[PDB]
Structure 1
């Protein structure tokens, strides 16, 4: 079958970034800000946290777009603890 598939033997890049209070301006530039080309395949770890022994699911949100200005549609895929909210809107995206 011929389809949109990853190249076997190529390298995955862990683009997830965890911060506490400060955000580095370098996190919002190349190579983190990557070109989409035909597309991407994502292998995402479901970071299972616990509060009062109650399970919570967290993972990095991904945005896909072009200029990230409200003159353009940005697709956003965001988790909400078991609910995957997917939107494509003329968002006024932040600098950071």
Structure 2
């Protein structure tokens, strides 16, 4: 079968970034801001946290777009603890 597949032997890149209070401007540049080209394959870890022994699911949100401004559609895939909210809207994306 011929389809949109990863290249075997190539490298995954862990683009997830975890901060606490401060955001580095270097996070919002290359190589983190990456070209889309044909597409991407994602292997996402479900970070399972517990609050009062209640399971909570978290993982990084990915945005797919071109210019990331409100005359252009940005696709956003954001988890909400079991609900995967996917939108494609003319978002005023933030600088950071």
Q: Shift in Å at residue 49 of structure 1?
A: 0.2
CA deviations over 1:65-84 (Å, ceiling 9, x no partner):
00001010000000000000
Q: Shift in Å at residue 9 of structure 1?
A: 0.3
CA deviations over 1:4-47 (Å, ceiling 9, x no partner):
00000000000000000000000000000000000000000000
Once residues 71 and 80 of structure 1 are traced to their aligned partners in structure 2, the CA distance between those partners, rounded to angstroms, is 26
CA-based RMSD: 0.2
Moved beyond 6 Å, runs of 4+ = none
Q: How many residues align?
A: 96
| Consecutive unaligned residues in structure 2, runs of 5 or more | none
Once residues 83 and 93 of structure 2 are traced to their aligned partners in structure 1, the CA distance between those partners, rounded to angstroms, is 22
Once residues 82 and 75 of structure 1 are traced to their aligned partners in structure 2, the CA distance between those partners, rounded to angstroms, is 19
